[PDB]
Every structure is written in structure tokens, then in C-alpha cells.
């Protein structure tokens, strides 16, 4: 069980750790988060009490190094940093634990929610979508635009999601215009799965990462990416049986975890109605259709 210590908390802030969140008061003796489960990526995220605009945060994996948070009064945010001195770090964590100045990652033993949201998400794939190669952790915020959003401006601060465009030469084989537009199987299976992602695990990893950025940061481009990746599968007549069964599980946990009050801004009516009721896969997503119909029958 790993630890992300905090130097201090000089400004009042709501702190997220994965799907959990805690209020910290200005200058409260808060020194971090302990008992973080090894084996998963994690996100530690922030919303300042005095500017609820710019949700921002850090994707990390405790197996890749010793990470801490320190407030920067110049840039005005909580920054993630790596401590290269193992013995200094162990000595910092042990002191803060002894003085019980750390919140415990509050996982219920029965509860597979975080596993179910991050099953295919790998830190090495995150670091290719979020490019800042001198750090082992990845910064995301509310305002970062995607490579696709930038085509339609600072390339260094962009989310490099895989570009999906249903009306693009990549999506449509010359001479198969109607076939490829109405049945996206070619685009899903040859171009995206065999061509770019190499396997369904990498595709699902990006889909799950896009959802979490949408949910935790209200990142609009992430939301567009999550919907495009759902729609590409649902609009294909030919999808491997294992991919459909796994997609149903993925979407079920995403819809289950979404705050009820954000469904209006995080769910695209057109895509979900199309996916559940008109698409080739209208009858393939039993779990997802049942939770959507019982939780968000207004949207449908």
C-alpha cells in the first residue's frame, strides 16, 4: 500500500483521489493520502474553494516512483513531484503516518469500482496521450484541448487522443463509400484495431481514460472522444463477441459511477439513443441498456 505525502495545504481545496473526495481547509495540518492500492493507475485531483474553475490533477502509478504534492505559490497550484532519494521519502512518510496527518484511501473490500473503471488503462498509454516525458506522472485539467479540437492551439498542452472522424478518407475506402459509412466495421477492425491500437485492450484503455478525464475534470474534448469510441463500435455490424461483452461491462460501471446531476452535460442524447435503440449493437449491451433506462430514462 503506497503513499502520496503533501508538504502542506496552504489553500482551501477539494482533493479527489480516484472516485473519492475530501475538503481540506486553508493551512489545515494535512500531509497526504496513504493505503493507495498497488496495481492500478490513480488520479489525484483538485478544485480550489476560491476558484471552482480549473479542476486539475495528476495520473500516476506508485510502482513507477515516489510521488508527493507541494503547493507552488507562484503558479498557484498543487504540483506533483518525484522524490529520487528513497530514504528521505520513506522517512517523510513514516513521520506523517506516526503523527496520523494522512487520510486513508477509503476502499471497501467488496468494491471493484476502480478496477472496473481502469481495467485497460496503463500509465505508459496515458504518457503518449499526455506528452511531458521528463515526468512519470501526467497533468490533466478542465481546459486542455485535444489534437482533433486543435485541427477544427498550443500543441504541448494537448490531449493526443486517437483521431476518429466518420467522414474522413481514413474512415472510407474509395469505392466502398455507402458500405463503409453505414457499416463502420472496416474502420473499427482494420484501421483502428489492427492498424493503430494493435488490440482491443489499448482501444478500451483510451476509451476508459477519455471517460475519466470527462468525469473528473469536465474536459469537453475527452467527452467527445469517449462518445466517438462507443459510437464506432456500436456502428459496426462485425465486432468480436468478447469486445461487445467487455464494452457492456465497461459502459455499465461508467454509467453507474457518473454523478446523477452531471448526466445532462456528460451524456450525448444522440449517441446513446443511436447506440441502444438504432445501431447494429442495439441488442448487444444488456447491462448498459438496463442501467441507462433505470437511471437516465429522461435522456432516452
Amino acid at each position: 500500500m503506497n503513499t502520496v505525502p503533501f508538504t502542506s495545504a496552504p489553500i482551501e481545496v477539494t482533493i479527489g483521489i480516484d472516485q473519492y473526495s475530501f475538503n481540506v481547509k486553508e493551512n489545515q495540518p494535512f500531509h497526504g493520502i496513504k493505503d493507495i492500492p498497488i496495481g492500478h493507475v490513480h488520479v489525484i485531483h483538485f478544485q480550489h474553494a476560491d476558484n471552482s474553475s480549473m479542476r486539475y490533477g495528476y495520473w500516476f502509478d506508485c510502482r513507477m516512483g515516489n510521488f508527493y504534492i507541494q503547493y507552488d505559490p507562484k503558479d498557484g497550484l498543487y504540483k506533483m513531484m518525484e522524490e529520487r532519494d528513497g530514504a528521505k521519502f520513506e522517512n517523510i512518510v513514516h513521520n506523517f503516518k506516526e503523527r496520523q496527518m494522512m487520510v486513508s484511501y477509503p476502499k471497501i473490500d467488496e468494491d471493484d469500482t476502480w478496477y472496473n473503471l481502469t481495467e485497460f488503462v496503463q500509465m505508459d498509454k496515458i504518457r503518449k496521450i499526455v506528452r511531458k516525458d521528463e515526468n512519470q506522472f501526467s497533468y490533466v485539467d478542465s481546459s486542455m484541448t485535444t489534437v482533433q479540437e486543435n485541427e477544427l492551439s498550443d500543441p504541448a498542452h494537448s490531449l493526443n487522443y486517437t483521431v476518429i472522424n466518420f467522414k474522413s478518407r481514413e474512415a472510407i475506402r474509395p469505392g466502398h463509400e455507402m458500405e463503409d459509412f453505414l457499416d463502420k466495421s472496416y474502420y473499427l477492425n482494420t484501421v483502428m484495431l489492427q492498424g493503430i491500437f494493435k488490440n482491443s485492450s489499448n482501444y478500451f484503455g483510451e476509451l476508459q481514460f477519455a471517460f475519466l478525464n470527462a468525469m473528473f475534470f469536465g474536459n469537453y474534448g475527452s467527452s467527445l472522444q469517449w462518445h466517438a469510441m462507443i459510437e464506432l463500435i456500436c456502428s459496426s455490424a462485425t465486432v468480436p463477441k468478447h469486445m461487445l461483452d467487455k464494452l457492456d461491462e465497461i459502459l455499465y460501471y461508467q454509467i453507474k459511477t457518473l454523478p446523477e446531476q452531471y448526466s445532462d452535460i456528460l451524456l450525448n442524447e444522440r449517441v446513446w439513443n443511436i447506440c441502444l435503440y438504432s445501431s447494429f449493437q442495439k441488442n448487444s449491451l444488456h447491462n448498459t441498456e438496463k442501467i441507462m433506462e433505470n437511471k437516465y430514462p429522461e435522456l432516452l
Binding site: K167, S168, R169, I172, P174, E177, M178, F181, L182
Partner: protein, 237 residues
């Protein structure tokens, strides 16, 4: 975006543009079977592709053979329209290719856009105008070449005959839309108005009769009267 009353003069500027109407591509007669079920029989159709500035009409005849063994024909008809318009553009020299294509029906936008991905600089636009191009098959010589075709064929016409020698392309388009609106509202009455005087004929190389400037004003008035009557009937007003 969409072509409307507000940007009407744009049709007659020097940017090459084409209207595409797919109304007459997929045509059927509905009939009873021996067992008393209903079936359709397709008849020959056409794409109506018109340069509103020049009057040049690219009439692509759609032979019933293109539907043989196909499913969802009303959907296929939009994609076949887009395939043929795309083929037409690629067949034209670069300096003759349109800068814009305006579709009379919004269902043609995605099929045409997908077929024209190779031409990112050609704008595909809808229109708010309710254009009567469905009535093209009420022009006797266009109906005749469609119904006689035994194979796919492209036929080139000037839908304005020689009018541009005497009038602007704005006035020629207004005359064409009034004639087609009349033919669409009451075909028998419109055709009577156009041919009632046997001394005015249609030249072998023309679609419409050889009216003097004064006879066109009379004709145009008779067409307006036809349209308003029919409107008072439809609506009892």
C-alpha cells in the same frame, strides 16, 4: 451553410455551382399482386444536375437495371446519386469543376459529402428554397429520353434554350422555377397554357416554345394565375 432568399443573387455570380435534385432517381408504380399483396415496379429515373448561371443540365438517366437485386432502394438511390455526381465532377476539367454543390434535399448531404472527400474545397450545401425540380419529368423531351433509355446514359441539355441571349440568368432561373412550379401544381393546365396556340412551336434543339418577349409576359401571367387558383382550392382561402 444553407442557401435561402437572403443569399439568392449568389446563384448568378461567377463561382461555378450546381444544384442536384434526387427526387426522380428512384421511381416506382405501386400495384396489386395475383395474391392481393402490394408490389412496386421501378421505372427509369434521372438525376437533375443544373448550373443555374448557364442553364447547362447534366441529366444522368437511371436505368431500372441498377436496382436489380439491391435492398433498401430509397437509401441506395441517395448513394447512387452521390456516386454519379462525384463521377461527373471527376469527368470535368479542373476549371469547369463546381466550387459548390447545392442539394435540394438534406438527406443528400452525407452521401454527397462522403463521395466528395477527395474534393475538400468543394462546398456541399443544403437550401431553404422549395425548388420545383421534381417537375422536370413534366418536360416532354426530358421524360421521353428517360423512358426510352435501355441502359445508363448521360444527356446534356440547356434548360433555358436561347433565353440568355435576351435575359439575365436571374430572370431565366425565375422563369424556369415559375414554369416548373406550374407544371408541379397542375400539369394539364400548365401544358395547355404552353401549347394552346399551335403557331408557336418548340425548335428541334429546344425544350420550351419559341415565345417572343411579349408572349413570355402573357405566358408568365397565365402561370401565376394557374398557381394562385390551385392555392385557393388546396386551402379553401
Amino acid at each position: 451553410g444553407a442557401m435561402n432568399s437572403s443569399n439568392y443573387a449568389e446563384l448568378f455570380n461567377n463561382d461555378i455551382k450546381l444544384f442536384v435534385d434526387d427526387t426522380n432517381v428512384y421511381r416506382v408504380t405501386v400495384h396489386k399482386t395475383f395474391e392481393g399483396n402490394v408490389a412496386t415496379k421501378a421505372i427509369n429515373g434521372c438525376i437533375f444536375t443544373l448550373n443555374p448561371k448557364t442553364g447547362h443540365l447534366f441529366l444522368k438517366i437511371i436505368h431500372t437495371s441498377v436496382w436489380a437485386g439491391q435492398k433498401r432502394l430509397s437509401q441506395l438511390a441517395k448513394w447512387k446519386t452521390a456516386e454519379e455526381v462525384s463521377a461527373l465532377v471527376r469527368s470535368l476539367p479542373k476549371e469547369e469543376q463546381p466550387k459548390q454543390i447545392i442539394v435540394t434535399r438534406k438527406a443528400m448531404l452525407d452521401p454527397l459529402e462522403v463521395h466528395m472527400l477527395d474534393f475538400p474545397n468543394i462546398a456541399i450545401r443544403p437550401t431553404e428554397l422549395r425548388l420545383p425540380f421534381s417537375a422536370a419529368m413534366s418536360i416532354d423531351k426530358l421524360s421521353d429520353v428517360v423512358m426510352k433509355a435501355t441502359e445508363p446514359q448521360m444527356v446534356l441539355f440547356n434548360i433555358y434554350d436561347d433565353w440568355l441571349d435576351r435575359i439575365s440568368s436571374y430572370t431565366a432561373f425565375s422563369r424556369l422555377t415559375l414554369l416548373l412550379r406550374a407544371l408541379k401544381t397542375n400539369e394539364e393546365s400548365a401544358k395547355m397554357i404552353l401549347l394552346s396556340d399551335p403557331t408557336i412551336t418548340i425548335k428541334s434543339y429546344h425544350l420550351w416554345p419559341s415565345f417572343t418577349d411579349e408572349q413570355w409576359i402573357t405566358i408568365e401571367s397565365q402561370m401565376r394565375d394557374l398557381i394562385l387558383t390551385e392555392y385557393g382550392r388546396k386551402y379553401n382561402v
